[PDB]
Every structure is written in C-alpha cells, then in structure tokens.
Amino acid sequence: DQCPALCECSEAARTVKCVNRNLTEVPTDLPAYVRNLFLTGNQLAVLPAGAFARRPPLAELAALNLSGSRLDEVRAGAFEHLPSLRQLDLSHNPLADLSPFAFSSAPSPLVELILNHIVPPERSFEGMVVAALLAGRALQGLRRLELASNHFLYLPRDVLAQLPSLRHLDLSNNSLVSLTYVSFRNLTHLESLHLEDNALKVLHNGTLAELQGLPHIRVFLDNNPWVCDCHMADMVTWLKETEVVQGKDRLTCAYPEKMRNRVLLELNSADLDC
Numbered sequence: 722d723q724c725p726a727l728c729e730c731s732e733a734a735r736t737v738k739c740v741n742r743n744l745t746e747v748p749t750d751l752p753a754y755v756r757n758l759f760l761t762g763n764q765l766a767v768l769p770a771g772a773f774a775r776r777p778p779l780a781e782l783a784a785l786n787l788s789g790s791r792l793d794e795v796r797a798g799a800f801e802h803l804p805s806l807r808q809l810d811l812s813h814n815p816l817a818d819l820s821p822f823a824f825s826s827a828p829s830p831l832v833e834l835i836l837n838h839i840v841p842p843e844r845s846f847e848g849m850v851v852a853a854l855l856a857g858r859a860l861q862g863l864r865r866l867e868l869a870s871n872h873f874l875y876l877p878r879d880v881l882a883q884l885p886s887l888r889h890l891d892l893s894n895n896s897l898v899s900l901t902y903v904s905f906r907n908l909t910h911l912e913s914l915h916l917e918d919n920a921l922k923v924l925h926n927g928t929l930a931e932l933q934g935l936p937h938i939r940v941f942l943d944n945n946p947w948v949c950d951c952h953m954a955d956m957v958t959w960l961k962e963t964e965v966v967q968g969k970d971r972l973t974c975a976y977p978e979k980m981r982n983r984v985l986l987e988l989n990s991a992d993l994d995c
C-alpha cells in the first residue's frame with residue numbers, strides 16, 4: 722500500500738508512476754494493487770530475469786511502460802511472474818541485447834507489444850528482434866505489434882506466419898524497399914498495416930491482389946518514394962478500385978522529376994511511361 726520513494730501512486734487508478742527520476746533499477750516494493758506501471762525517462766541500463774517478480778506477485782499488473790529509460794539489455798525472463806501483463810512498451814531504448822527469451826499451450830498474456838525506435842547506434846538487429854518475437858511460440862495472443870523507426874530492411878515473413886492473432890502491425894519509418902517475397906494472402910485477421918515513410922518504389926500485381934483479398938485490412942502507404950513509370954500502372958488502377966488504402970489522396974510520385982509530387986490517384990496511362 723505505501724508508495725516507493727521516487728514514485729507517485731494512486732490506489733484509486735491502480736496506477737504507479739516513477740517517471741523521469743533516473744532510477745537505475747526497478748523499485749522492489751511496488752504495491753500489489755498496481756495495474757498500470759510507468760517507468761519512463763529513467764536510466765535502467767539492464768533489465769534482469771524476474772525484474773518484476775515479487776511475493777506476493779504483481780498479479781494485477783496489466784500495462785507496463787519502460788519507454789525512454791536507457792535500457793540497453795533485456796535479459797531472459799525479464800517479465801516473468803506477471804500473469805496479467807497485456808501491454809508492454811520498450812520504445813526509445815537502444816536495445817543492443819534483447820534476449821531471445823525476453824518475453825518467454827501456456828502462452829505469454831501479452832496482447833500489445835510496442836517496440837518503436839529500439840535500434841541502437843550502428844549480427845542483424847532485425848534478426849534479434851524477430852527471434853525474441855517467435856521464441857517458444859510464447860506470443861500467441863499478440864494482437865498489436867509496433868516496430869516503427871528501427872532501420873529495418875525487410876518485412877519479416879516469419880512474424881506474419883507465426884503470430885496469427887495479429888490484428889495491427891506497424892512498420893512505419895523503416896527502410897523497406899520491396900514487398901516482393903512476402904505474402905499477405907492468408908492474413909485474415911489483419912486489420913491495420915502501417916508502411917508509411919519507408920523506401921517503397923512500387924507495389925506489384927501479386928501484392929495488390931493479396932491485399933485486396935483481406936476482409937478487414939487498412940493499409941497506410943503515405944510518404945514513400947513512389948516511382949511513376951510504366952511499372953506503376955497496375956498500382957494506379959488498383960488504387961482507383963480499392964477501399965483498403967487509408968488517406969489514398971495523399972500518395973504522391975517522387976520520381977521521375979517530371980512527375981514529382983503528382984498525386985497517384987490522378988495519373989493516367991499517358992503519365993506512366995518507360
């Protein structure tokens with residue numbers, strides 16, 4: 722019941738905030754009632770196994786925000802003994818060392834995992850993150866996954882295949898160039914796909930047909946360097962026909978120079994040349 726030093730607590734809101742206080746470790750005496758825990762703006766460095774494990778357990782803790790706390794290492798079992806944990810945010814931490822077992826018929830309770838801007842200053846980083854996502858099949862109930870701003874070069878096919886509860890996937894502000902060797906064909910449950918601010922030049926017929934087949938999907942494609950040549954014709958025709966693209970009026974050509982900033986929806990065959 723008390724409230725740890727350097728924290729603010731509310732029994733009524735079941736909320737604990739230990740924010741911008743330069744904590745170097747997770748407080749040991751958190752009250753058992755906590756449902757929402759904010760540990761942002763600190764200097765944690767490393768989160769060890771069982772960093773939140775207590776007796777009695779924090780059995781009500783459902784939302785945990787560790788954003789912007791200079792974490793460079795998250796070790797195996799860091800989140801163990803948190804049977805109610807639904808939402809975890811590790812964004813804006815330079816995670817050089819994310820254990821493959823950081824998050825792991827007995828799946829993790831996690832539903833939402835927010836991992837934006839986790840890439841440390843320049844062993845594949847994307848590979849390390851994917852391993853942590855897929856270890857033990859622990860992330861079965863995961864419905865929302867955010868992986869913005871990570872310098873990722875590819876859309877990881879294994880994540881789409883092996884997290885089939887996913888409803889929301891954010892890969893905005895990465896460096897994706899192509900979707901050619903990834904299939905969206907069977908992603909029934911996928912409701913949102915954020916691909917804004919990548920390096921995509923064009924979408925090909927295969928991709929377009931796959932997306933068109935999904936019952937719930939909303940795709941975000943703004944601020945990519947689209948190339949308005951003859952290879953763009955299928956995508957322009959699709960864009961005119963589709964309802965799955967959000968804010969489709971904003972999509973513009975980056976190249977060639979004579980088409981720069983032209984709206985894709987307005988383009989006709991005579992504009993799309995090679």
Ligand SMILES: *[C@@H]1O[C@H](CO)[C@@H](O[C@@H]2O[C@H](CO)[C@@H](O)[C@H](O)[C@H]2NC(C)=O)[C@H](O)[C@H]1NC(C)=O
Binds near residue numbers: 761810835
């Ligand atoms: C985790 O805590 C952070 C830090 O307070 C929240 O960060 C804010 O996020 C909003 C929406 O993305 C931004 O517009 C703010 O400017 C952010 N502030 C900072 C300092 O980064 C973040 O929303 C929290 N997430 C959850 C799920 O609690």
Ligand SMILES: *[C@@H]1O[C@H](CO)[C@@H](O)[C@H](O)[C@H]1NC(C)=O
Binds near residue numbers: 741742743
């Ligand atoms: C936390 O650390 C930074 C860097 O030393 C400092 O500027 C800041 O004042 C500290 N925060 C608090 C609340 O004292």
Ligand SMILES: *[C@@H]1O[C@H](CO)[C@@H](O)[C@H](O)[C@H]1NC(C)=O
Binds near residue numbers: 840870871895
């Ligand atoms: C986009 O990504 C780059 C690379 O991670 C980053 O430095 C920048 O802050 C990001 N933009 C936003 C809005 O976060």
Ligand SMILES: *[C@@H]1O[C@H](CO)[C@@H](O)[C@H](O)[C@H]1NC(C)=O
Binds near residue numbers: 906
């Ligand atoms: C969806 O299709 C991919 C191949 O494109 C396959 O690996 C994956 O298992 C499929 N998903 C399900 C739920 O069967």
Ligand SMILES: *[C@@H]1O[C@H](CO)[C@@H](O)[C@H](O)[C@H]1NC(C)=O
Binds near residue numbers: 912913
């Ligand atoms: C319905 O709308 C909400 C808010 O726009 C969204 O989160 C959800 O993904 C949508 N659901 C489906 C099934 O499209």
